[PDB]
């Protein structure tokens, strides 16, 4: 039974989505209970035909930088996803709203953990396709970040993608112009948007013309090394963008804080 295994609390988050706070009765494990309407499901996969989101979550459900799927149920008109819920958390979007531009030491720690998480997805055959501050939780006690909402993701492939369901203002210019992209280089573009967002306090681009324009104006004081990493991630030509390895070897990325150090210095 579904209503017998979990105590169901209130709605979580900040729109047209249905995710409830919950606790697992077996052991009081905090959980997030996500309801997905069958009629709204974009892509389907198979294990038993299930939403692709379930397939992707199972593939990455090993490592703590990605949300863990604990279980799922099918219902007449919906699927229900039981996700392991960290607490206390705030998502990175609200975190940046309240604190403004992050100090580079903090953005370095956050960005590094996002890189490790995305690398984990790719190693598991999963492309998230909606990397953004709204899809990142911060465990305020442990200083650990969690990538959430794989509802726009896809199996990772090396050929061209011609569909996209993520966030337009994080999507790369080859998607804007030609409605095609490759997975890794598109991911790196969104990581550039994300890094700018962290060190400047908001995303750089709001309109298609800015996205394809290939000019990055810095509205806050940002180190030359960080600016260079950001501009590299936002190279207009996909093959000019860095690989994950090049990102993590960039001089701006050296001497990262551990998660616990991050929490003690910046979150406690």
């Amino acid at each position: 039974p579904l209503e017998s295994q979990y105590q169901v609390g209130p709605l979580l988050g900040s729109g047209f989505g249905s995710v409830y706070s919950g606790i697992r009765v077996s052991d009081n494990l905090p959980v997030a209970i996500k309801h997905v309407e069958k009629d709204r499901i974009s892509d389907w996969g198979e294990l038993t035909r299930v939403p692709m989101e379930v397939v992707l979550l199972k593939k990455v459900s090993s490592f703590s930088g990605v949300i863990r799927l604990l279980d799922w149920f099918e219902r007449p008109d919906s699927f229900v996803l039981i996700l392991e819920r960290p607490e206390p958390v705030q998502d990175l979007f609200d975190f940046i709203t309240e604190r403004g531009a992050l100090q580079e030491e903090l953005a370095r720690s956050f960005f590094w953990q996002v890189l490790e998480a995305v690398r984990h997805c790719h190693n598991c055959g999963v492309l998230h396709r909606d990397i953004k501050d709204e899809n990142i939780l911060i465990d305020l006690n442990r200083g650990e970040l969690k990538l959430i909402d794989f509802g726009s993701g896809a199996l990772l492939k090396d050929t061209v993608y011609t569909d996209f369901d993520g966030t337009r203002v994080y999507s790369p210019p080859e998607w804007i112009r030609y409605h095609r992209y490759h997975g890794r280089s598109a991911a790196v573009w969104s990581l550039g948007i994300l890094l700018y967002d962290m060190v400047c306090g908001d995303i750089p681009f709001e309109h298609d013309e800015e996205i394809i324009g290939g000019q990055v104006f810095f509205r806050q004081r940002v180190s030359s090394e960080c600016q260079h990493l950001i501009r590299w991630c936002l190279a207009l030509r996909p093959s000019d963008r860095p690989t994950f390895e090049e990102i993590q070897n960039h001089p701006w990325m050296q001497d990262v804080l551990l998660p616990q150090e991050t929490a003690e210095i910046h979150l406690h």
Partner: peptide, 9 residues
């Protein structure tokens, strides 16, 4: 300036 969320889709 106005910072805002952006829904997926």
């Amino acid at each position: 300036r106005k910072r805002r969320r952006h829904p997926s889709g």
